[PDB]
Amino acid sequence: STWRDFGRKLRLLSGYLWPRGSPALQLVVLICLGLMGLERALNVLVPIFYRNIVNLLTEKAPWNSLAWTVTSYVFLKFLQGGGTGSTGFVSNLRTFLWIRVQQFTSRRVELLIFSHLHELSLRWHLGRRTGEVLRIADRGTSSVTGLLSYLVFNVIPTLADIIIGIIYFSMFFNAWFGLIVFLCMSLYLTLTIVVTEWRTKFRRAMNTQENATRARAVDSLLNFETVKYYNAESYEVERYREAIIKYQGLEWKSSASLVLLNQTQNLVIGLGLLAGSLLCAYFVTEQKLQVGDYVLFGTYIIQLYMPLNWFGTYYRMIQTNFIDMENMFDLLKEETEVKDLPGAGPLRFQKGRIEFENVHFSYADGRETLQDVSFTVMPGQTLALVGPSGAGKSTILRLLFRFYDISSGCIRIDGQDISQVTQASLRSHIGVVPQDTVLFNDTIADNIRYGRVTAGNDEVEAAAQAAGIHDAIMAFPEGYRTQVGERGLKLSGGEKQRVAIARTILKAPGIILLDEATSALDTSNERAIQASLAKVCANRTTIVVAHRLSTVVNADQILVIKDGCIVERGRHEALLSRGGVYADMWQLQQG
Amino acid sequence: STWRDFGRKLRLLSGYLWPRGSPALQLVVLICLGLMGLERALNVLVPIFYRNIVNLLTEKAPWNSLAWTVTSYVFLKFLQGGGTGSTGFVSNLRTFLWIRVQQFTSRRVELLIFSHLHELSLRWHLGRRTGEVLRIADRGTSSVTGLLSYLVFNVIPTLADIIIGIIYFSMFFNAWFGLIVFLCMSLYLTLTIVVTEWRTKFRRAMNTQENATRARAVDSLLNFETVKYYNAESYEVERYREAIIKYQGLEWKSSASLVLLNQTQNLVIGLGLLAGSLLCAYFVTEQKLQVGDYVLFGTYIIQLYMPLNWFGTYYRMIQTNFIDMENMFDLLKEETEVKDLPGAGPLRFQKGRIEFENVHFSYADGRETLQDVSFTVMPGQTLALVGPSGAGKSTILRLLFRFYDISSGCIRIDGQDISQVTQASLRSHIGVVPQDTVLFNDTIADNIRYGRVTAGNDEVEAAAQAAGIHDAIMAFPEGYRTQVGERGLKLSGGEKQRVAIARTILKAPGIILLDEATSALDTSNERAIQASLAKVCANRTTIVVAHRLSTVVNADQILVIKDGCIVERGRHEALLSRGGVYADMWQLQQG
Ligand SMILES: CC(C)CCC[C@@H](C)[C@H]1CC[C@H]2[C@@H]3CC=C4C[C@@H](OC(=O)CCC(=O)O)CC[C@]4(C)[C@H]3CC[C@]12C
Ligand SMILES: CC(C)CCC[C@@H](C)[C@H]1CC[C@H]2[C@@H]3CC=C4C[C@@H](OC(=O)CCC(=O)O)CC[C@]4(C)[C@H]3CC[C@]12C
Ligand SMILES: CC(C)CCC[C@@H](C)[C@H]1CC[C@H]2[C@@H]3CC=C4C[C@@H](OC(=O)CCC(=O)O)CC[C@]4(C)[C@H]3CC[C@]12C
Ligand SMILES: CC(C)CCC[C@@H](C)[C@H]1CC[C@H]2[C@@H]3CC=C4C[C@@H](OC(=O)CCC(=O)O)CC[C@]4(C)[C@H]3CC[C@]12C
Ligand SMILES: CC(C)CCC[C@@H](C)[C@H]1CC[C@H]2[C@@H]3CC=C4C[C@@H](OC(=O)CCC(=O)O)CC[C@]4(C)[C@H]3CC[C@]12C
Ligand SMILES: CC(C)CCC[C@@H](C)[C@H]1CC[C@H]2[C@@H]3CC=C4C[C@@H](OC(=O)CCC(=O)O)CC[C@]4(C)[C@H]3CC[C@]12C
Ligand SMILES: CC(C)CCC[C@@H](C)[C@H]1CC[C@H]2[C@@H]3CC=C4C[C@@H](OC(=O)CCC(=O)O)CC[C@]4(C)[C@H]3CC[C@]12C
Ligand SMILES: CC(C)CCC[C@@H](C)[C@H]1CC[C@H]2[C@@H]3CC=C4C[C@@H](OC(=O)CCC(=O)O)CC[C@]4(C)[C@H]3CC[C@]12C
Ligand SMILES: CC(C)CCC[C@@H](C)[C@H]1CC[C@H]2[C@@H]3CC=C4C[C@@H](OC(=O)CCC(=O)O)CC[C@]4(C)[C@H]3CC[C@]12C
Ligand SMILES: CC(C)CCC[C@@H](C)[C@H]1CC[C@H]2[C@@H]3CC=C4C[C@@H](OC(=O)CCC(=O)O)CC[C@]4(C)[C@H]3CC[C@]12C
Ligand SMILES: CC(C)CCC[C@@H](C)[C@H]1CC[C@H]2[C@@H]3CC=C4C[C@@H](OC(=O)CCC(=O)O)CC[C@]4(C)[C@H]3CC[C@]12C
Ligand SMILES: CC(C)CCC[C@@H](C)[C@H]1CC[C@H]2[C@@H]3CC=C4C[C@@H](OC(=O)CCC(=O)O)CC[C@]4(C)[C@H]3CC[C@]12C
Ligand SMILES: CC(C)CCC[C@@H](C)[C@H]1CC[C@H]2[C@@H]3CC=C4C[C@@H](OC(=O)CCC(=O)O)CC[C@]4(C)[C@H]3CC[C@]12C
Ligand SMILES: CC(C)CCC[C@@H](C)[C@H]1CC[C@H]2[C@@H]3CC=C4C[C@@H](OC(=O)CCC(=O)O)CC[C@]4(C)[C@H]3CC[C@]12C
Ligand SMILES: CC(C)CCC[C@@H](C)[C@H]1CC[C@H]2[C@@H]3CC=C4C[C@@H](OC(=O)CCC(=O)O)CC[C@]4(C)[C@H]3CC[C@]12C
Ligand SMILES: CC(C)CCC[C@@H](C)[C@H]1CC[C@H]2[C@@H]3CC=C4C[C@@H](OC(=O)CCC(=O)O)CC[C@]4(C)[C@H]3CC[C@]12C
Ligand SMILES: CC(C)CCC[C@@H](C)[C@H]1CC[C@H]2[C@@H]3CC=C4C[C@@H](OC(=O)CCC(=O)O)CC[C@]4(C)[C@H]3CC[C@]12C
Ligand SMILES: CC(C)CCC[C@@H](C)[C@H]1CC[C@H]2[C@@H]3CC=C4C[C@@H](OC(=O)CCC(=O)O)CC[C@]4(C)[C@H]3CC[C@]12C
C-alpha cells in the first residue's frame, strides 16, 4: 500500500532524473557517476599510501623511492581533499558538472507546473489565492532537485563508504577491527536517532513562546496614547521582562539538550578510538602488525566518523523536503472542471447565429441563477442585455465563452452546438471588451499586439489609427514605443479602452460579446468611444451589455432579465408602451 | 576620527560584556576565559603525544609504558575533540556556561531599548511606524550578542593558535618549517580575500534577476481572464521560459565562481602540504628528525588549516552585524522633543483652576493651529468645547496633557504654570475618557485595574458597580474573570465605555478632560452613559468636548472655536440670541 506509493514516488524521481531528450546531459550524468565511483576509490586508497610512507621511514629506505612515494601521496590527497571542508578536485568537478543537469530538470518541472496551472478552470482560480500556489510550486521544484541530489550523492555513497571500510578492516586486518568499527557505527547512529527526537521536543515550544513575547511587546507600543494616559511605563516594562524571562528559560532547555547531544556523540567516538588504538598498539607490539598500520587505523576511522556529523541536519531537512514534494504532487493532482470532449472537432463557423434555449444554469456558491432564457440573434443585428443590477447579465457572457459548463440546455451557433466543438476554435471567433482593460509591464507595441502575437508595427499602427488612439501614442514622450504599465507610464480609462478596441480590431473576430465599461470619464470621450465602437462593430453580431440606457436605444432587440428569466422583449418604444419596470427605471435614470 | 569612534564602540561593547551587578556571572566569565586558554594548550599538546606514541612504536618499547601513553593521548584527544565537527569536552562546557551570560546581556539591552522607546514623545511615534522599529531593536540585540561572542571566542583564539603554531615550529623544529607555515597562511588568506569580492559581485545580480522572473510569472497568473480571452497560454509560457533561461545563466556564473574559490583554496593547501612533507621526509632520512615528527607535522598543519575554511562566512556576516549595530545605536541616539525642566518639582494642586491665555500653538505638519485662545474654568464648573469639526478641539486636550510643548503662551492650574512641574505629577491628576477605549489581551480584572495597578478585586468590583457594568460582568460566561480582548470575547461600545468609566473612577482624578465618544450605540444606553458620566463627574472640573449638542445644553460656559480663535462665548440661550453659526447649526442638527 504505502510502500507501493513510495515505489511510485521513486519511479517518478527516476523519470525526472534522466534527461529524455538531450544527448549531452546523458553523457554528463554518466561521467558524474564515474567520478562518484572514483571518489570512493580515492577515500580507500589514501590511508594505504600513508601507511606505505610510514613503513618506509621506519626502515632505512633511500631518498630515491621515498620522494616519489611522498609526492604520489600528496597528489592523491589533493584529489581526495580530506574530510569535511576543503573539498577535493573530484568532488568540485562533479559539483561543477551537475549544475547543467539540475538546471535542466528544474526548468522542465517549472514549465510543467505553470502550463498545468494555466490549463485549469476559472472556478478553481477564483476559489484559490495564487500567491500560495506559486509558493507551493517553487518549494516543490526546489524540494525535488534538492532531494534528488542529496539521496544520490550524499547518503548512498557514504553507506557504500562504511560498508567498504568494514570489509577492508575485516579482510586485511584482524576481523576484530571490523567488529569494532561496526559496533561504533551502530551505537553512533542509534544514539543520534534516540536523542534527536528528544531535542526537537524541547525545540518545538521555544518558537511558540518567542511568538507570544513579541506580540505583547508590539501591543504595548501600538497603544502608546493609553499607556501615557494611565502612567504604566514601569508596569509594561515589568510585564515585558517577565515574558522575556520565560523565553530565556525555554532557550536554556533547548541549548542544554543540544550540548548533551554533542557530548554523547563525542564520547562514543572517543570510546571507539580508544578500543582500536589500544588493540592496534598491542598487535604491533607483538610483531603482528607494522608501525604504519597504527596511523592507517587512526586516519581511516576519523575519515569514517566525519560524514556522520550532519546526520541530524539531513534528518530534519528530508522530512520537510518530502512533505513539500507531496504538496506539489497534490497541486498537480487537480483536473479541469470544464473538459474538452474526445471529439473536440473544429468549428463550422460561416456567418454566425446565436441561439439560447431553456438554459437553467445552476450557479454554484451564488444565489443568482438563470431559469428559462431563450432568444435568437441573427447575423448583423443587436441584442441589448439590459436589466436590473444582478449577476445574471455577466453570467450570460461568461457562459457563452464556455468559462462555466452548461447545467441544463443547449447553445447553438450557426446551428452547431458549442459543447462538442473544441475550446480554442470556438473561443477564437469571440471578441470581448472587458469592464476594465488590463495592461502588462511592457511597451505599447506588445500590449496592442497581445490580440495577435504575429503582427508588424505597421499593422498595430493602422489598428491604433482605426481605434483613434494613434495621436495620443505619438504625443507620448518616449514616442510610439513608450513604457506603459503598472511599473511605467499610467494611462486613463479612455486610453486603455481604445487599447482594447485596437486589440479586438486586430483580433478579427466574427461575433463580439461587447460589454460596456461605462466608466463615464468624459461625455465627449464617451461619444468618441461610441463612434469607434460603431466602427469596430459594423457589420457583425453583438450582444451589447449596458449598465446605462443610451446604447439600449439603438438595439434591434431589447431584453430585460427578471433575475433569471427574461420578462420583457422587443423594442424600446414597445417596452415603454408596455410600462413595466422599463418605463419607470428609464424615467428615473433619464432625470 | 573614525578610529576614535571605533574605539568608543569597542568600549561600549566592553561595558556591555561585563555584568555590573551579578557576582556569579563575573566568576562564570572568568572560568570561561580559563577554559579558552586550556583549549589552546590542548590543541598544541595533542600532536606531541601522537609523536610520542609513534616514536615508542618505532623502537621496542614495552607494553607497560605504551598502554598508559596511548590511553593518555586518547583522553587528551577526547578533551580537544579534534577539528571542526565533534567538538571536545572543553568547548562544549564553555558553550554551555556562556548561555547564562549572553541571556543576561540580551535581556538588559532589550529592556534598555524598550524603556527608551516608551520615553520618547508622541510626535515621533506618530511619524514612524512601530513594526520596523521593533525589527531594528531585535536585530541590534542579536547583532550585539552574536558579534561579542564571535570576536572573543573565534577570531582572537585562532589568531593566537596560528601564532603559537608558528612559534613552535620555528623553535622546536628547523626554522624552515616556521617559514613554510607562515607563507601558507599569508597566501591562503590573501587569495581568499581577493576572490571573495569577485564572487559576491557575481552573486549580487542573481537576486535581482530572481525577483524579476517571479514577478512576471505571478502577473501572468493574476490576469487569468485576459490570458484566456486572447489565447496566450503558449505565448506566456514562452516568456516564462526565456526569463527562466536568463536566471539560469546568472546561476551558472555564481556557481562557477564558487567552485573556482574552493579549488584555489584546496590547491594552496596541497602545495603547502607537499613542501612540508618532502622537507620533513628528507630530514628524517638524514637522521635529523625522528619518524614521529613526520606525523606530527601532518596532523598539526591540517589542524591549523581547518579553522580558516569559514573565513568567508564570518566576513560576509560581520559586515551585516556591524551595520545592524550602528542602526540600533542610531535608534538610541534620538532624544525626547518635550523634556522635563531641571526643576521638575511636584504639583501644588489643591482645588484646581484652569487658565488659557493667548496660546498661539503652531501645529507642525498641519494647517489647523490655535491663535489667541483664552478662557478660565473655576472649580466645580463646566466648559463645552464645541464648534465646527476641526483639529483645534482635540489639540486643546492634548496640549493640556502636555503631549505637545507650548509654542507661545502660558498654561496655569491653580495659579501654577505647568511647564515647570514634572510630567508625571501633572499627568496624574488628569483623567481622560478617550474616543475609543482600548483593551489589551487579558482578563476583566487587569483591564479595569489598569487605571491603578495596586487594587484588589473588591475595589474593582465596587468600581464596576458604580460605573454600572457589574451586571454584564456577572452575566459573562466565564464569570467575573472572563477573557476579553482582541484574542478573546468581544464587547460593544457601551461595554468598553463603562470600562473606561470604571478606570477613571479608580484613577481618582482632580480634573477630568472628558471627551464625548458619541458612538450612538443606543439612545437609552446613551442616557445611561450620561447618568454614569454625571455620577463620575460630580463635584469636579470638566472641559467636556462634544461632537453633538445635547451635553452642550447644560454647560455653564459654552465656547465656539472659529478654527483657531474663540468667536462665541456664554450660555446656550445667550448664544442662540446672538444668532451666529450657533443658531443655524443647532437648527440643522436638531432637525
Ligand atoms: C578537468 C580536466 C583537466 C580533466 C578531466 C577531463 C574530463 C573528465 C571533463 C572536464 C570538463 C568536462 C566537459 C565539461 C563540459 C561539457 C559540456 C557538456 O554538455 C552540456 O553541458 C550540454 C548542456 C545542454 O545540452 O543543455 C557535455 C560534457 C562536457 C564536454 C564535459 C566532458 C568531460 C570533461 C572534458
Ligand atoms: C560502485 C561504486 C560504489 C564504486 C566501488 C568501487 C570499488 C568496488 C573498488 C574499485 C577500485 C578498488 C580498489 C582498487 C585497488 C585496491 C588496492 C588493494 O591492495 C591491496 O592491499 C590488495 C592487493 C594485494 O594483495 O596486493 C586494496 C583495495 C583497493 C584500494 C580497491 C578497493 C575497492 C575499490 C575502490
Ligand atoms: C601543482 C603544480 C604547481 C606543479 C607542482 C610541481 C611539483 C609536482 C614538482 C616541483 C618540484 C618537484 C620535485 C623536485 C625534486 C625531486 C627530487 C627527485 O629525486 C630524484 O630522483 C632526482 C634528483 C637526484 O638525482 O637526486 C624526486 C622527485 C622530486 C621530489 C620532485 C617531484 C615533483 C615536484 C614536487
Ligand atoms: C556488519 C559489520 C558490523 C561486521 C559484522 C560481521 C561479523 C559477523 C564478523 C566481523 C568480526 C568477526 C569475528 C572476528 C574474529 C574472530 C576470531 C576467530 O577466532 C580466532 O581467530 C581465535 C584466535 C585465538 O583463539 O587466539 C573466530 C571468529 C571471530 C570471533 C569472528 C566472527 C565473525 C565476526 C563477528
Ligand atoms: C559511556 C558511554 C557508554 C555513553 C553513555 C552516555 C550516557 C550518559 C547517555 C547516552 C544516551 C543518554 C540517554 C539518551 C536519551 C534519553 C531519553 C531522555 O528522555 C526522553 O527522550 C524520553 C521521551 C519519550 O520518548 O517519551 C531522557 C535522558 C536519556 C535517558 C539519556 C540519559 C543519558 C544517556 C544514557
Ligand atoms: C558537560 C556535559 C557532560 C554536558 C552536561 C549538561 C547537562 C548538565 C544538561 C544537558 C541537558 C540537561 C537537561 C535538559 C532537559 C531537562 C528536562 C527538564 O524537565 C523537563 O523539561 C521535563 C519534561 C517532561 O516531563 O516531559 C529538567 C532538566 C533536564 C533534565 C536538564 C538537566 C541538565 C542537563 C542534563
Ligand atoms: C564498544 C566498542 C568500542 C567495541 C568494544 C569491543 C572490545 C571491548 C572488544 C572487541 C574485540 C576484543 C578483543 C578481541 C581479541 C582479543 C585477543 C585476546 O588474545 C588473543 O587471542 C591473543 C592471540 C595470540 O596470542 O595469538 C585477548 C582479548 C582481546 C584483546 C579482546 C579484548 C576486548 C575487545 C577489544
Ligand atoms: C573502550 C572500552 C570498550 C574499553 C576498551 C578496553 C580494551 C582496549 C582493553 C580491554 C581488554 C584488553 C586486553 C586484555 C588482554 C590482553 C592480553 C595481555 O597479555 C598478557 O600479557 C596476559 C595474557 C597472557 O598471559 O597471554 C596483553 C594485553 C591485552 C591484549 C589487552 C589489550 C587492551 C584491551 C583490548
Ligand atoms: C541507516 C540510516 C540510519 C541512515 C544513515 C544515513 C547517513 C549515513 C547519511 C545521512 C545524512 C548524511 C550526511 C548529510 C550531510 C553531509 C554534508 C555533505 O556536505 C555538505 O553538504 C557540506 C556543507 C557545508 O560544508 O556546510 C557531505 C555528506 C554528509 C557528510 C552526509 C554523510 C552521510 C550521512 C550521515
Ligand atoms: C564538568 C565537571 C565534571 C568538571 C569541571 C568543573 C567546573 C569547571 C564547572 C562545571 C560546572 C560549573 C558550574 C555550573 C554552574 C554554575 C552557576 C553559576 O551561576 C549562575 O549561573 C548565576 C546566574 C545568575 O545569577 O543570573 C556560577 C558558576 C557555577 C557554580 C559553575 C562553576 C564551575 C563548574 C563547577
Ligand atoms: C593566553 C592564552 C592564549 C593561553 C596561552 C597559553 C600558552 C602561552 C601556554 C600555556 C601552557 C603551555 C604549554 C605547556 C607545556 C608544554 C610542553 C612543552 O614541551 C617541550 O617540548 C618543551 C620542554 C622541554 O624542553 O622538555 C612544549 C610546549 C607546551 C605544549 C606549552 C605551549 C604553550 C602553552 C600552551
Ligand atoms: C570513559 C569511561 C566509560 C571509563 C573508560 C574506562 C577506561 C579508562 C579503562 C577501561 C579498561 C582500561 C585499560 C585496561 C587494561 C590496561 C592494561 C594495563 O597494563 C598494566 O600495566 C596492568 C596489566 C598487566 O599487569 O599486564 C595498563 C592500563 C590499561 C590499558 C587500562 C587503561 C584504562 C582503561 C582503558
Ligand atoms: C611571522 C611568520 C611568517 C614567521 C616569519 C619569521 C622569519 C623572520 C623567520 C622564520 C624562518 C627563519 C629562517 C629559517 C632558517 C634559517 C636558516 C639559518 O641558516 C642556517 O641554518 C644555515 C644552514 C646551512 O648553511 O646549511 C639562517 C636564518 C634562516 C634563513 C631564518 C631567518 C629568519 C626566518 C625567515
Ligand atoms: C598554482 C598556485 C600558485 C595557485 C594559482 C592558482 C591560479 C590559477 C588562481 C589563483 C588566484 C586566481 C585569480 C584570483 C582573482 C582574479 C581576479 C578576477 O577578476 C576580478 O576579480 C577583477 C575585479 C576588479 O577588482 O575589478 C579574474 C580572475 C583572477 C585574476 C584569478 C585567476 C586565477 C588565479 C590566478
Ligand atoms: C575544475 C576546477 C579547476 C575549476 C574550473 C572551473 C572554471 C572552468 C570556471 C570557474 C569560474 C569560471 C568563470 C566565472 C566567471 C567568468 C566571467 C564571465 O564574464 C563576465 O561575467 C565579465 C564580467 C565583467 O566584465 O566584469 C566570463 C566567464 C568566466 C571567466 C568563467 C569561465 C569559467 C570559469 C573559470
Ligand atoms: C609556497 C610555500 C609552500 C613555501 C615554499 C618554500 C620552499 C620552496 C622552500 C622554503 C625552505 C626551502 C629549503 C630551505 C633549506 C634547504 C636545505 C638545503 O640544504 C642544507 O642546507 C642542508 C643542511 C645540512 O646538510 O646540514 C637545501 C635546500 C632546502 C631543502 C630548501 C629548498 C626550498 C624550500 C623548501
Ligand atoms: C610546493 C612547491 C613550492 C614545491 C616544493 C619543492 C620542495 C619540497 C623541494 C624543492 C627543493 C628540494 C630540495 C633541493 C635540494 C636537496 C638536496 C639534495 O641533496 C643532494 O643529494 C644534493 C646536494 C648535496 O650534494 O649535498 C637532497 C634533496 C633536497 C633536500 C631537496 C628536497 C625537496 C625540495 C625541498
Ligand atoms: C587577519 C585577518 C585576515 C582576519 C583573519 C581571521 C580568521 C583567522 C578567523 C575569521 C573567521 C574565523 C572562523 C569563523 C568560523 C569558524 C567556525 C566556528 O565553529 C562554528 O561556529 C561551527 C558551526 C557549524 O559547525 O555549523 C569555529 C571557528 C571558525 C573555524 C573560525 C576560525 C578563525 C577564522 C578563520
Author numbering:
A (entry chain B), B (entry chain A): 237 to 827
Paper text:
One superfamily member, human ATP-binding cassette sub-family B member 6 (ABCB6), has been implicated in several seemingly disparate diseases. ABCB6 is expressed ubiquitously as a half transporter which homodimerizes to form a functional transporter. ABCB6 is a porphyrin transporter that is abundant in erythroid cells, where it is capable of accelerating porphyrin biosynthesis and protecting against porphyrin overload. ABCB6 has been implicated in dyschromatosis universalis hereditaria, a condition characterized by hyperpigmented and hypopigmented skin macules.
Several cryo-EM structures of ABCB6 have been reported, and here we report an additional high-resolution structure (2.93 Å) of human ABCB6. We purified ABCB6 in the presence of n-dodecyl-β-maltoside (DDM) / cholesteryl hemisuccinate (CHS) and obtained a reconstruction of ABCB6 to a resolution of 3.5 Å. Our final model is in good agreement with other deposited ABCB6 structures in the inward-facing conformation. Notably, the resolution of our cryo-EM structure (2.93 Å) is higher than previous cryo-EM structures. In our preparation of ABCB6 in DDM/CHS, the TMD0 is too flexible to emerge in the 2D class projections. Using our cryo-EM structure of ABCB6 WT, MD simulations were employed to study the effect of the L356P mutation on ABCB6 structure. Conversely, the elongated loop of the L356P mutant extended across the ATP binding site, occluding the site, and causing direct clashes with the overlayed binding conformation of ATP.
